[PDB]
Amino acid sequence: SISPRGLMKQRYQRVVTARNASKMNFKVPNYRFEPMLNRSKSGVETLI
Amino acid sequence: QQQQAMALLDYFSERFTNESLYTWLISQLSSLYLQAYDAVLSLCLSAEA
Amino acid sequence: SLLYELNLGEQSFVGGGGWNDLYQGLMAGETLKLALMRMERVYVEQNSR
C-alpha cells in the first residue's frame, strides 16, 4: 500500500505601517531663515 | 569532489572582503548615523522656528 | 579655530586614532563628517550677537 504526501502550506504575512507623530516648537535662534535653510539642507542631504 | 567543496568553502571564507568587514563597518556607521540624526534634527527644528 | 573664536571653555570633537589597517581607515571621513556637524551645531547655537 502507498499514499501520497500533502503539499506544505504557505501563507502571506501582514506588514504594519502605522506611524505616530509628536509636536515640537523651539525658541528663535540667532540666525536668519535662509542661512538656516542652507545649513539644514546640507545636513539633510548628508544624512540621506 | 567533497574535498574540493569543503576546501572551496574555506577559501571563500578567507576572502578578504568578508562578513566580518561588513559587520564592523555597519556597527560604526550605525552609531554615526544615529548621532547625525539627532544633531541635524535639532537644527531643522530651529529652522522651522 | 572654532574654540578660539568662541572661547567656549574646553570641549572637543576631533580625536586621533581614526585610521586602522584591518579596516584600511575606511570609516574615518565619516567620523570627521559627524564631528564637523557637531561643531557646526555648536557654532550656530552659540554665535549669538
Swiss-Prot record, chain B:
- Compartment(s) where it occurs, according to its Swiss-Prot or TrEMBL record: Secreted
PTM annotation, UniProt: The isolated toxin complex includes 3 peptides starting between residues 768 and 778 of this protein, which might be physiologically relevant.
Instruction: Please state what is observed when this gene is inactivated.
Output: Cells with a disrupted yenA1-yenA2-chi2-yenB-yenC1-yenC2 locus are no longer pathogenic in C.zealandica larvae.
Q: What does this protein do?
A: Part of an orally active toxin complex (TC) with strong insecticidal effects on larvae of the Coleoptera Costelytra zealandica, Acrossidius tasmania and Adoryphorus couloni and some Lepidoptera larvae. The TC has an endochitinase activity.
User: Which proteins does it associate with, and in what oligomeric form?
Assistant: Semipurified toxin complex consists of at least YenA1-YenA2-YenB-YenC1-YenC2-Chi1-Chi2. The Yen-TC:K9 subcomplex is about 26 nm tall and 22 nm in diameter with 5-fold symmetry and 5 copies of YenA1, YenA2, Chi1 and Chi2; the chitinase subunits may be solvent accessible on the exterior the complex. The Yen-TC:K9 subcomplex has no insecticidal activity. The native complex with additional YenB, YenC1 and YenC2 subunits is 16 nm taller and is insecticidal; the toxicity-conferring subunits are present at about 1 copy each.
Q: What is this protein called?
A: Toxin subunit YenA2
Q: Which organism is it from?
A: Yersinia entomophaga
Gene name of the encoded protein = yenA2
Q: Which residues of the full protein are shown?
A: 1073 to 1121 of 1364
